[PDB]
Ligand binder design. Sequence first.
Ligand SMILES: N[C@@H](Cc1c[nH]c2ccccc12)C(=O)O
Ligand SMILES: N[C@@H](Cc1c[nH]c2ccccc12)C(=O)O
Lengths: 102, 102
Amino acid sequence: QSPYSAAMAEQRHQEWLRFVDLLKNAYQNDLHLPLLNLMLTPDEREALGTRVRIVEELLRGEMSQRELKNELGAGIATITRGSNSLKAAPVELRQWLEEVLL
Amino acid sequence: QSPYSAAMAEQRHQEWLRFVDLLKNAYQNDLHLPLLNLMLTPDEREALGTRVRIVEELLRGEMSQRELKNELGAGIATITRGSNSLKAAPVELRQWLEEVLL
Ligand SMILES: N[C@@H](Cc1c[nH]c2ccccc12)C(=O)O
Ligand SMILES: N[C@@H](Cc1c[nH]c2ccccc12)C(=O)O
């Protein structure tokens, strides 16, 4: 699975997959909310909420550098993270976000 | 929604819900993996993977304090976080995890 199959890496990788599957199930059972609440800190949840917006406004292409930073709290670093992260996503996600966010 | 409806709080709260819904959709479209990859840092993913284990072993009731800390990296604080977090979950999640993790 992992781009570097060792045993430790692979393990960490599988544990992540185990989380994904857990969640998938949670959704199927309408237990997603409470699960995510359990698994994440308040601050992490808040951060996820914000990243959606950052992702949102990056796709939109209206908000400027100073705008992102001052209104959403995104400076060169964060906007760098968000950006390359967007470039790294397979095109299908990028297409989907367009339809869905926008 | 929020246990303290203001405007700022509620807003933050809704943004989180917007994330939940996004993800729900992603799952429905088989775009969950790439989405989560986009939305989370490597370290956050790793942490999620570990929390599953911590949650796992807390439910199981075999692993001791020293064991959790030394094997899973969980000291009094983390095990405190994990614990009260478990107590805070509605009983339906607690029941479900039993069936599913165990
Ligand atoms: N996948 C991103 C996670 C993240 C951090 N900050 C963000 C801002 C916007 C979107 C995603 C992000 C990265 O690993 O760095
Ligand atoms: N909901 C937990 C998130 C968390 C932190 N560390 C954990 C360890 C195990 C399970 C959950 C957690 C809390 O807010 O603190």
